[PDB]
Amino acid sequence: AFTVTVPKDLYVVEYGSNMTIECKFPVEKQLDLAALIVYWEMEDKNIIQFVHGEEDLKVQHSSYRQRARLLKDQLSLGNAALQITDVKLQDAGVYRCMISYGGADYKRITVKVNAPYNKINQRILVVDPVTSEHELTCQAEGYPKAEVIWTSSDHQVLSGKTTTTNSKREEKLFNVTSTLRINTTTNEIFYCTFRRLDPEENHTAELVIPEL
């Protein structure tokens, strides 16, 4: 009988990427478009309703107008391919594709969206120009949550303090800030590493103590 197949239950996608998620269905020689209905959905938001050879924009959820599309050309090969452009953290969750072509069936697809701690900002300030205590700062945005390990030029761990909040520019992006307050010298090298899981990622910035 009619069943739908999912090549993969789970897509892991980088923030700002293009994404193609697929549901397969059995098709003989020629495709009967007047019988085929494809329906993609997420969190009750209606993404695609393809009926009688066309996507029904009338039923579509507004915030998908220009960014989501079914690949008509793939349908002939029994592939219902939903493409979402510029994938954001909002786009993570469980998607469902229902296909009706003879019988009907539906499957679930999980998207999880990464965001890399690639842009690490840093600040170096002098606390007391007598004791030579410095305040070092690293901050970056990413997903999921990262912890910060501070290491010396000699690869020893130092006690920093991390604060973790939500971003304002994008969405559920974690804003991670860590401060190291230490007595140190000109030309000394410190390293702050952002450590996140899913999948594992260790991203490091380098801070050098300036002059006068």
Binding site: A1, D9, Q49, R96, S100, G103, A104, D105, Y106
Partner: protein
């Protein structure tokens, strides 16, 4: 329309029938009723469909759907249970016209114990 799928947790011994009830808040002739198994990973797997007055098994006719005189309640029977039938099941309702909709009951658990 909301679906309920009970009993929430059901146990039978190997060899015995298991019966859940899929209850819809309303039913009509253009609905497709799907009987689904949940995978370890949580994917749906079609066991049987009911439409046009008939239950059609996907690959094993031990999974049968019977419509009750009620018309909106259905018995979902796993006849002659086996140990590998154990797991999480649910029914889903599919609207086609004029608007494609999937509605799913919560899951129910089947535990199939050693033959008596």
């Amino acid at each position: 329309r909301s679906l309920t799928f009970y009993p929430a947790w059901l146990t039978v011994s190997e060899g015995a029938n298991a019966t859940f009830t899929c209850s819809l808040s309303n039913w009509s002739e253009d609905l497709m009723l799907n009987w689904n198994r949940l995978s370890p990973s949580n994917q749906t797997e079609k066991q049987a469909a009911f439409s046009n007055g008939l239950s059609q098994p996907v690959q094993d006719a031990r999974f049968q759907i019977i419509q009750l005189p009620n018309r909106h309640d259905f018995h979902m029977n796993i006849l002659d249970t086996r140990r590998n039938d154990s797991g999480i099941y649910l029914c889903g309702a599919i609207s086609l016209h004029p608007k494609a909709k999937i509605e799913e009951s919560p899951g129910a658990e089947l535990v199939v114990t050693e033959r008596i």
